[PDB]
Amino acid sequence: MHLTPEEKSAVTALWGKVNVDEVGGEAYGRLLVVYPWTQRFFESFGDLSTPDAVMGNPKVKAQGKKVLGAFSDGLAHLDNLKGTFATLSELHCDKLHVDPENFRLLGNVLVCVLAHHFGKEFTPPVQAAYQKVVAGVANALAHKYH
């Protein structure tokens, strides 16, 4: 994907401060809270009855860690997001049956979590760079759908 040099530097600098497990659990838990129809893929996950239940659920935290871990790994390959996520794209389509709109919703909640956690440091230009990245990752994860 094409990022300006400034954009790439902005993404890498902020990501160096991210606790991937913590941010992953927070963003994935907020996905299930804010867009609760996304819980359709997590029927075996236990208690998702209230926001606090969702956020504190160990399976939700564990799933967020896996997801953000793969996202984090993808940030090392910003010039080839489609190749980096091809295998996970096929998995999410063929085996998991997940509508790729969910990737966009997760991207929106991750940007809100970054803003909430970092506050003023998540400036308008930093956000714009992260918007390009979340759109790129969502596009990459949707690429092998058929």
Binding site: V34, Y35, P36, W37, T38, Q39, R40, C93, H97, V98, D99, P100, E101, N102, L105, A142, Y145, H146
Partner: protein
């Protein structure tokens, strides 16, 4: 909001559909699955080949719900209450897909109603399916 002219337009056009409603509902789904393959993620349990009984059945149920909605156009939230519950609480289809099916229902009506699909009727049908879609996603959160 649907104006009185929109309601007249929709009743006239859906009235023309008549007995073919179910067939047109099936064709709209078939069109959607081919044009927008991500919508197939909601039907991994169906045979989606052309002519499938499951797709014909889906088409007929959706068409009957649209007939009901047209018949109760001034009180759609009530008429579609069970289906808004079903989509919000069980099926949980992402709201984005309602626009994809709506477009494919419009394309199917266009292809089958040469006389009736005027610019004004097209606009009214588009508004009506957007209204139906809004009712069906109203309880999602």
């Amino acid at each position: 909001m649907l104006s009185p002219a929109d309601k007249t337009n929709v009743k006239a056009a859906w009235g023309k559909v008549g007995a073919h409603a179910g067939e047109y509902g099936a064709e709209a789904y078939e069109r959607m699955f081919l044009s927008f393959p991500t919508t197939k993620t909601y039907f991994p349990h169906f045979d989606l080949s052309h002519g499938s009984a499951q797709v014909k059945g889906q088409g007929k149920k959706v068409a009957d719900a649209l007939t009901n909605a047209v018949a109760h156009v001034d009180d759609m939230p009530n008429a579609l209450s069970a289906l808004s519950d079903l989509h919000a609480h069980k099926l949980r289809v992402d709201p984005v897909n309602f626009k994809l099916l709506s477009h494919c229902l419009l394309v199917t009506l266009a292809a089958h109603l040469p006389a009736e699909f005027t610019p004004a009727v097209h606009a009214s049908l588009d508004k009506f399916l957007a209204s139906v879609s809004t009712v069906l996603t109203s309880k999602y959160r």
